[PDB]
Amino acid sequence: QNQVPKWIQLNNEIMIQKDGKFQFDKDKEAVHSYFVDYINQNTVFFHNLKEKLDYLVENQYYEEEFLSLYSFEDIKEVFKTAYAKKFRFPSFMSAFKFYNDYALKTNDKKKILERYEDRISIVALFFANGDTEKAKEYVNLMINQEYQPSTPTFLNAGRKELVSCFLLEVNDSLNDISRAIDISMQLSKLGGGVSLNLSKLRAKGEAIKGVVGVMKLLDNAFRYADQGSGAAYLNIFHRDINDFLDTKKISADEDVRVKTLSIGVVIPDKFVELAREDKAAYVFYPHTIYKEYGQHMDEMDMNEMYDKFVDNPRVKKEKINPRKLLEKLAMLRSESGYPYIMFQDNVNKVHANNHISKVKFSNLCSEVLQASQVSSYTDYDEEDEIGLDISCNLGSLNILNVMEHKSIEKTVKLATDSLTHVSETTDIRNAPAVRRANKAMKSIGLGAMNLHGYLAQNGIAYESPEARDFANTFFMMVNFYSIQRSAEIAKEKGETFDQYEGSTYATGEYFDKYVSTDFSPKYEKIANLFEGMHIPTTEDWKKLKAFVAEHGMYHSYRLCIAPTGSISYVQSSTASVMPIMERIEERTYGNSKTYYPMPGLASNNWFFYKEAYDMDMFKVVDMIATIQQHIDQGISFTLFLKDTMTTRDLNRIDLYAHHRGIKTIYYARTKD
Amino acid sequence: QNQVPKWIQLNNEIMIQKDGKFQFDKDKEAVHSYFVDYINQNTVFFHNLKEKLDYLVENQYYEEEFLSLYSFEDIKEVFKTAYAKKFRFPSFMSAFKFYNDYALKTNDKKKILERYEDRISIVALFFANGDTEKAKEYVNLMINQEYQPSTPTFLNAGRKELVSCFLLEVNDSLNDISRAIDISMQLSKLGGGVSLNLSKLRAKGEAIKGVVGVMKLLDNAFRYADQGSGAAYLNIFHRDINDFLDTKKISADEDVRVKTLSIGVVIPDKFVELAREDKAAYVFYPHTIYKEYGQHMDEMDMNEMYDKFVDNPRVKKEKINPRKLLEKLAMLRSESGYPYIMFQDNVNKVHANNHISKVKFSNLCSEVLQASQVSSYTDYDEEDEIGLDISCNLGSLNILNVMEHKSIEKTVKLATDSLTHVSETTDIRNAPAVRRANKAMKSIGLGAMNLHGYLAQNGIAYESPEARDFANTFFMMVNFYSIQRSAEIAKEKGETFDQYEGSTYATGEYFDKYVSTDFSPKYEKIANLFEGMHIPTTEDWKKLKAFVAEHGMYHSYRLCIAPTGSISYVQSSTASVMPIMERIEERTYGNSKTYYPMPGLASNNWFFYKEAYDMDMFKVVDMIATIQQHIDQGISFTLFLKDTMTTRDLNRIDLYAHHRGIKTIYYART
Ligand SMILES: Nc1ncnc2c1ncn2[C@H]1C[C@H](O)[C@@H](COP(=O)(O)O)O1
């Protein structure tokens, strides 16, 4: 009679509050209704697991070979390990987000083929590659919700290329731009994220015998393929910087604006210096530097060479006010959310592989921060000079379940092992710089989520010195055991990342802080949270230094924290290490609406679940800064602002971030 | 007697772990056992040096002449200089490879007649030619292991021909092919490699089987072993190029097949230009060019004449795809390791003696790059026109020990002196062109070894710019003092190689590069390695230029880097200027096995001893090209491939070598 489903009615009854409190009981009833009145009524029937796999293999849903490395007797034991837990989703959105987005369905995209246990088992069977007892550990890791592989790895593993997130580097030429566009199409379909570095390209007004032209070509190309979006990064000292920023003006033109492309700005310390002392700034025509000095502008140190570019008459320049350009960033970040900011020297001052290259730019989510070398694609393909692009596959720890299971070591190592397997199984063909990077650099991206949810459920405010003290110790341990496993893999395989000999891991310069100072918790309240787990001391780090020195390291880069917008719902976690935007999330379902309380929200902890826009973003910067200490790549840092804040107030946040050693700044969220 | 001997049991304990580390200490015990429990119990007794030398001269072991130039008091002092060093082999394979393969033994191959000190003393007394104080200098040079003469020179010096690298021209005639096989077998008997140039021979179609006929006929003679190997080179603009390449195939048709003979392909820039712009290419019939134009094909210049050959209707041709033919060369090197590529214009752009001839081919090991003129052997002996073939006696210096002792001048000077004495003493009887060229050209091949061993032990990666910076400054200094010694010998002897007056040394074009552009080390880390010895400035080269112009030059060619395989074990050195293959080398002894950690390998320097297969081959090409700047002949350059590389990837590497000025690329290992 009534069209609104019973599970939606029960979900909405959370808000119809009685006593003087919201009915958090009703979401457990709502999810139960979702299963018995819908999900279980739309699951394809099979007699047993034998019939189920044979159906999916023979009808081209699942891949052929990864299953054949196990006997069926062991496959049943692995699947049985997943179902043994009797995992239950605590909320409607948890079950909905999995069964709507992640669970395998029929070709007539209606009926459900995979349960939550079947997905995890298949993914576990893909990672282990024949080791049946390893798959059992991967099942226990993923079903206890200690580890969560990223959207592309978790969705596609086992089916009929897992690594999303690529970063290309374009050289100044038509062959290079045309290939960079063609390679972006191949990597758009394969997963999603493509991020181009346009700092090498020549400015508008330099002839051949600007960068917006390439950004429009990219935007049109990404739109042609209906399929993840792309992005473009540019150095602030580039001439077209203004035209680049004007592509995300709210009052822009139809042809100059880009819809698909996100934009990032790379800011060296020299630009902040000029702003502090109120001097004028000069933006450069990079090809005039190339002809003069031999090297690209983007490859040279601006803190040494800026003055020399100014005094040289052979280099073409453009006078600008840096303080006014910083205001323009803040204006656009308020208006549109873009651009992303990268503080180049805050990345490179703590960077291990500067000898390979300086980190010049970042990816779609401002998280991946690695070295890279430009390619040179010619008419005769056999005369190409292939360089180093960046490709990185992702995954996230669950801070809450890792702490309670006391599995901070094991969860890092299995995650690192699974990420290494995804890296090993990757086969890229039409992107030789991306293929060479995967072989040589062997990069992975182990992040984390559920930081607020953990802190809020233990009565610890996100922006207090307690919360920051916990994160200091927690993420130190993540870095310790990640490095330890990287060396253990390098011993077991006898392989290291290309030019390991030159890195700060090899020279020992990386370990100086961990050898000298002690990162165990100051507050006694937080020391007790790690009870039952050995916190590494300085003496342990000295041994880990010597172990790395002798056996090398397999991974060039290891840790990076992603935004994790969607998979966080599957895990019942607060998204990433960020604070929470809303206590209750009202979202449209389909003419009805759904309400989602944050995980573990109650009258006990209502004020520990403080909304992000109400926080002091200076103290939020302090949290990311203390976490950044023990993450060798970047952290996707969303700023949460109010409509009342001036462009003066935003510059003060952005420059405090730079002052505190923040590597990257993501999307700027603003609220009424 | 029938168990595993103690020295091997100790050697095998290197692979047994202690605290997660190898036992590199155990190999020093393995040598000491090898000496006490074998070598010292299988040396022949002589009471003194006089009775030893008398017995060895009397029983036809040593030669009579070279010893008679000294008095016995002098010979006693020269031997006594060798034993004064107290030289101790550090690893098992160093001592073993010497005493097993080099040290003189009794006629039944059992008991040892020479210690390491005895071998060096005889070689030093041979080289010095009566100068007793120079004999003492040679003993020190070889026993401090600053210099190592080549296998054939080091093994045979002062016993019952020392040169064992030959390159022969072959003219377009059956009668010339008869002597080509005749000479090849005469020179192959003594142990030397013999390379042939088959580019002048007429292709199949032209009447009188082709170049394959000569290779197959030559291969059968070589295959009759009861003595050294053989090779064959062919120009890429010759119609039989594809039949020539088909001999070394995976699915080789037994009629058109070659077991023993190594193969090389000579590639001018004009062929690479045709592949780049993607025009269809024309390979030629050579005897049609000879009749129409009056000269042999590979003597003429392909950059000038390619368009003229295609426009000429009388000259016969055959159209092929150049882009696919480079992919064929890459496929075959991935399969078999052959052919060798010689980038001809990368040789002849820097070649001094073009006026004699352009360099048309190379030797067995793709390193000797010299001028050559074809001979004409006929039915009447007195109407034979004896041309210029190539021989080259070899040697190479130790990069590690030269730098430690700071003897980069003294070693290059003396090594050049020792090679000159072998060059002088050579008496080739049944190869008239090889004899004539030895007298005329007077060329030598001073190389180098232990490059990686040196770099790795000073914390410098092989692929780094720091390494290239060392190589640039090091091999410049070698070339400086080698040219200086050649001019010094030219003044002392009062002699010069035939047509020196026409060379770029005489005209002064050779020194253009060095009179400008200072070749000191850029990096200060590298500059501190040469501390204590003088790095030649541009002004020093300007003075050398004039000294060469006044007094001339004795040697036609002076420097080539050979792939030092067997003798590098004796020196405790990494082979050649190449990178290392295996960190620890496992080889079968005889149902047991032996282990050789690369010399100076330790727990701490492990990652500087990178295995060559793991390296970026583009960065290795840059290292070889850096050295090639200062070596007037070629460098034996093995490319180290993994099986995951496509023909797409290997074709990209071979063209990059061409692009960086590489002269020759050798066997491809996997
Ligand atoms: N909350 C929740 N999460 C996951 N799966 C669920 C849930 N509620 C029911 N179910 C599914 C799982 C089992 O197949 C069955 C058990 O129902 P029951 O009567 O609830 O034990 O229904």
Ligand SMILES: Nc1ncnc2c1ncn2[C@H]1C[C@H](O)[C@@H](COP(=O)(O)O)O1
């Ligand atoms: N490594 C090595 N090389 C050459 N000869 C050796 C070596 N080890 C032992 N010996 C021989 C040489 C002498 O006859 C004696 C000296 O032993 P010593 O203990 O070495 O003083 O042992």
